[PDB]
């Protein structure tokens, strides 16, 4: 197994927030683009990164990849629900529950980035990341959309120094 397996698993699990968010934004007619990359969130992210002793620019790059992957899922869901509205989730999303999950996923990702900073800067990162993704894609039974979104979300993991 790869040492990035848990970091990638946390990222893949975090991508699934897209399903509740699209389900809510669909009914509420909210823009998918209004996703939170605002100065207050960027500063909080950087202050949380410095608190974990990891590079804020690196962490910001990771979450810039993550948000793009998340929006991409929401757009594909909107595409599916436009073609066949009946396939839309019947159940309302539990966003109070999702809020606490995201907080836990964020912390796990940041502590994992610190806990594996040496590997993320190493030449073996690329091979380790590829093995991690396949494990997570197999173990999480990720479909084509989530696989590609996981690739987008993790494409800067090995840009560490």
């Amino acid at each position: 197994t790869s040492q990035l397996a848990e970091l990638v698993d946390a990222a893949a699990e975090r991508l699934e927030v897209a399903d509740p968010v699209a389900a809510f934004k669909w009914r509420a007619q909210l823009p998918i683009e209004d996703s939170g990359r605002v100065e207050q969130q960027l500063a909080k992210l950087g202050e949380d990164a410095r608190s974990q002793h990891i590079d804020p620019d690196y962490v910001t790059r990771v979450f810039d990849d993550q948000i793009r992957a998340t929006e991409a899922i929401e757009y594909s869901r909107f595409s599916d629900w436009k073609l066949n509205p009946a396939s839309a989730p019947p159940e309302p999303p539990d966003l109070s529950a999702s809020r606490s999950a995201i907080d836990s996923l964020n912390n796990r990702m940041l502590s994992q980035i610190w806990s594996h900073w040496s590997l993320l800067s190493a030449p073996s990162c690329a091979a380790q990341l590829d093995r991690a993704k396949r494990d997570i894609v197999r173990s999480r039974h990720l479909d084509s959309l989530y696989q590609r979104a996981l690739t987008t979300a993790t494409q800067s993991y090995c840009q560490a120094l």
Partner: peptide, 13 residues
């Protein structure tokens, strides 16, 4: 708005 960039933040409209 409903945000997912860093925190899942939710303001009622």
């Amino acid at each position: 708005y409903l945000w997912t960039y860093y925190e899942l933040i939710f303001k009622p409209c």
